[PDB]
Symmetry: D2
Subunit: 384 residues, 4 copies
């Protein structure tokens, strides 16, 4: 069965007692024993919960993994994976342009001696080769990257990692299982911040780690319980509900993004445009090869200054100025003051992040309405 079928039906008719099509929400923190010294499949929600189990199976199926571990946030899924595979003295190799939260977590802990971290431009074969020569225990890959949507060869990185015996984990948040499948590309693990596209409705905060090896699933589950990062039952339910429309949401959002990309290619005030589909985007060839779609995330550089930017923004009404991405509603953010405000000004410029770069998480509103709304912003930027 195709991904559209899996997303819609996985977990349906789970209820064996009442014949409910949609599974109930098992909020119970505990479960009675069948008899003395005879517990059932679950004995304590923190360790195992029936509702979390259903969504874990659905997410594992969508990525083609053996099983999944749902965590309470995407950041705790990242913390779970690093906790399991790294101890003081061990080395982690991560992308030089990875998610700000991820960088901050690794940096903060490595600065305490908890483990070693090496940030590398994984697109640079020489740089990458040298990092892997240091024999890391874990290699994190994140593609496309934010906010320039730069793409790196997942299959190649995972292979080189496997060559030196490092476990590979791919943060597939930006494209979701509907537009990219890292396990099918050679990764040992794939994780997501379910807070984004998977839930798709901006009202659930959760993370997940999916593994190709069932023994690794069990190890992850063991550690998730041990440090207490398993996800809640209610969030599990809403996440599963959001998942039901994952495919049509991703296809329409992507279709909308392509329409916006095409329109922006004609705009004079668009100094630079970024999207995996653009032949000139860093790693486009790779994207065309390893992705099932180019994605709904995009970004562009407005020609002008801070007031031109404030003018542009002030002219919008269908894009909400806010953090995050992946929801059904269109959002816009200014990297220099939002996603990368925690990055040194010189660094941002050093990272190729312009002070006038705006990133758009395309929603599923009508594409022409969204484009007409951008037209209004551009009209406003050009007025003095």
């Amino acid at each position: 069965r195709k991904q559209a079928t899996i997303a819609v039906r996985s977990g349906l008719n789970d209820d064996e007692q009442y014949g409910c099509v949609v599974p109930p929400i098992h909020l119970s923190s505990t479960y009675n024993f069948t008899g003395f010294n005879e517990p059932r499949a679950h004995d304590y929600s923190r360790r195992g919960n029936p509702t979390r189990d259903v969504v874990q199976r659905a997410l594992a199926e969508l990525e083609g993994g053996a099983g999944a571990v749902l965590t309470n946030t995407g950041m705790s899924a990242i913390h779970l994976v690093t906790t399991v595979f790294l101890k003081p003295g061990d080395l982690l190799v991560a992308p030089h342009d990875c998610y700000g939260g991820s960088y901050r977590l690794f940096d903060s802990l490595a600065k305490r001696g908890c483990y070693r971290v090496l940030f590398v431009d994984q697109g640079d074969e020489q740089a990458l080769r040298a990092a892997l020569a240091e024999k890391p225990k874990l290699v994190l890959v994140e593609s496309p990257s934010n906010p320039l949507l730069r793409v790196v060869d997942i299959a190649k990185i995972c292979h080189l990692a496997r060559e030196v015996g490092a476990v590979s984990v791919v943060d597939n948040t930006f494209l979701s299982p509907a537009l990219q499948n890292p396990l099918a590309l050679g990764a040992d693990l794939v994780l997501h911040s379910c807070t984004k596209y998977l839930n798709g409705h901006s009202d659930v905060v959760a993370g997940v780690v999916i593994a190709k090896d069932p023994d690794v699933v069990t190890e992850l589950a063991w550690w998730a319980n041990n440090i207490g990062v398993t996800g809640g039952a209610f969030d599990s339910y809403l996440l599963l509900r959001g998942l039901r429309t994952l495919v049509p949401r991703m296809e329409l959002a992507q279709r909308n993004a392509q329409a916006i990309v095409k329109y922006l290619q004609t705009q004079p005030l668009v100094k630079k445009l970024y999207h995996p589909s653009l032949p000139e985007n860093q790693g486009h060839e790779i994207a065309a090869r390893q992705q099932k779609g180019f994605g709904a995330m995009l970004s562009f550089e407005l020609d002008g200054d801070e007031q031109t930017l404030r003018r542009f923004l002030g002219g919008l009404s269908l894009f909400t100025l806010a953090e995050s991405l992946g929801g059904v509603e269109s959002l816009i953010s200014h990297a220099a003051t939002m996603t990368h405000a925690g990055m040194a000004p010189e660094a941002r410029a050093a990272a190729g992040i312009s002070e006038t770069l705006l990133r758009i998480s395309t929603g599923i509103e009508d594409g022409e309405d969204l484009i007409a709304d951008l037209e209004n912003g551009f009209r406003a930027a050009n007025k003095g």
Copy 2:
């Protein structure tokens, strides 16, 4: 004024837009800015959420702390504290009889070199002083302990700790802020598995860390966001709801526990009985001095064999055989088979845990109803 008033009214009327008496559930994962580079008090749920903020204030207030950080599980509240206060090379002194999850966590990470752990009998003055001489960075106290309900001097232990420069954190789950206040006894932090008494309804899994120092709150908050362990908004809602009846719940449950002890004090089949109110109970006098009540948890050894055990249990119907405690419903567990089945039989015995020891988490059903139920249990225990 009084804690009963705090639990009931904290958070009420928070709504300034619609005038709702009960605050709404703020599930939104993100928040809009008022203008470019002008965020509001909240920018991302994982970092800060309006509903979680409210329940944190209620919990802080209930323990007399400056602030609280709600985590997704009690275990992650313990992991958060250890993560903030220990780094490779630092030492943690924990109770030799602390909660199983706490023990397993500290042990598993200490084995990896993340930090050092020394498990000590904090009731053994000589043993305690020696460990503190190791100059730990953190000292964890957990009283009463489970399942023998032994009690230790929190005020003293915290004083000693502070002297050696160690930060003290007390796991107050067993009694809740309604029956004991560690901060009042000189602790730097008090934490609870809100999954227990605080929520009181067995349908929420959450943890919380409350600090005396506001600077410590800010730091615990930064780290909780960093490693991703902040609790959910929905759980925050149901938790605060459960909190509204904490005082009446604890009062009635304690009364029923006291009534059950009495009845048990006539059972030729009760080989031994444990409760902090009994004069022969380890640490009873300290208990009478630092606690506000003796608690709703109790346990007793069944004079007989496994067969005698299965029989007694088989004759109950108002006590559910299950893990956990703190809920309005009465539960019973067999440590050897549940709580401590992870210990070798001799190890359990060494720890003073009998193969026929039964723990009761007293609920708020009718006392007489509860005693009567036990009556039938014993009747069967006898029967050939």
Copy 3:
């Protein structure tokens, strides 16, 4: 089992598939067939829902009835009963001082010829008898009444109504099953606005109709499904959750009320006091006879003009000025502008409701704290 045991254990361990102690929330609107022409116990939520079934069982049991039908509001439970036992031509006899929503509903449909309504002072036997001679098909009793708390003889009225062939229904909202059981006093049915005391947490809106006769239950169930007033599954879950602490909630709210009553008796600014516990209170002897407690609701007339009352309310802090009652938090209401705002001053006065009468819905905050707050209001009232 006693009330407290019923309220706490109803529904526990219902989950036979995963053994959840707390029943899961069955939100599913549809159920599958076990095969062709093979329905299940449930087929359509609007008709039958597993979570609604549980709470209906609990409520029927708390009032000692055969069964219950949970409706979406207290008003629709009232509308359901009238729809079932009245058609054009039939007569309904109701209390002259019944709930304002009940009055408005009966009046509004009577005005359209849907049925005839007769409002009588059921405390007046000849009047009561005269009305019963008209041969009503249904008689509604509501005791105590709002806001004066007048009490009438439920057993007597139900007795008289039964001999003329009228079905009796009692609105037991004000006292709840914990303080009064109309089915035992002779009624055919008892209904409540679960929105108040039963839920007790001001975050659920629902109603319930409980019948002595099982046949009447299937009747009410058929009609509730027919006109679509069945309660929702999520509300059913939050209501059952609230039900868990009904007994200690009523007990404590009741004690705080008596203490407050006692206090007001010593207040000069208190012109009149109203509480079933007071000998002088209308129907006091009947209350002491038919009630298991005198209730948590009370009202008093302030000695002074409007500015005096504003002053009094303005000095308060532990009572929220709002409609509704039955929550854990203490609420205060000015009948002339709130509960009875819709009623000419001539009608209000005629009905015996002062322009300075205040109603208190006692919560479970600390009693001393509550009185200390009233003292603040009084001090301000007499403050010039």
Copy 4:
């Protein structure tokens, strides 16, 4: 603002206090006054609720109405409209083939004399016009009809209805606002069971009545509060969440429906097919003219007997045998034993409802997978 833009953004950023993008869930049953006699927009949740308001505005906007009243069920929305526009002596003209629940409701109350009802074949000019000449106060239209998908001329019926002073209401559940807009076709009111397509996730039960005249919205709102059929806050939240994806869901469901129709037209075992897009389908010219799409509901008569039907259903695995429709998951039902089981076979026969008619509520799974499943059922229908 196109419908996709409205469905996705209506109500977004409603929270002015915290700036939440997604509106929080207002469960609060009561609201405080900003002072004595200074109530707020909301004073009692059963009357007005902030979360119900948001979804009401969204539903109203999608149908182009002035406002909407959300009820607890689709049946109570139907009961609310008939309650407002009919009283004893008044006449209701309803579709001869309307929804079973609707028929039962009107029949049951007309039999008690609550009002008069006339079931007419609205596709027959003679019968339709003779009924309108009876001067009804209300005319209910339901197109397409279940389970044959017959379509009637809404603009024509509403035109003739207005001529005789009747109010027109259209039950637009089957197509939803995304595929049909009765107000734009001249109706006074449009109602829906939100339990179906609007919510689309089978975990909400709700109804809604949308009116073109703001004065009628007020009247319907007054009555909804009066008889207590207003929908719940939690349901309002989940329904709004479901609305977010209405357009892509209907589009895809419809697209799949067309692919299934095309396929079934090739099955020798399909002796009769029904779908509005079919040239020979009763009312096709009207459908093509008044609908924005032909819809996702379809039906067909299996060539064979009851054992054949059994074999066919048994061969399916992606279609759940269950009542209801409109969810993201594909469902199938056998009218004779499910939807119209309570219709004497003679009646079903006179109604053109075959004993082997199967209705399909097309979901959003991959269309090829669904077709393959169907082929499997057919290959099994042949093994006999």
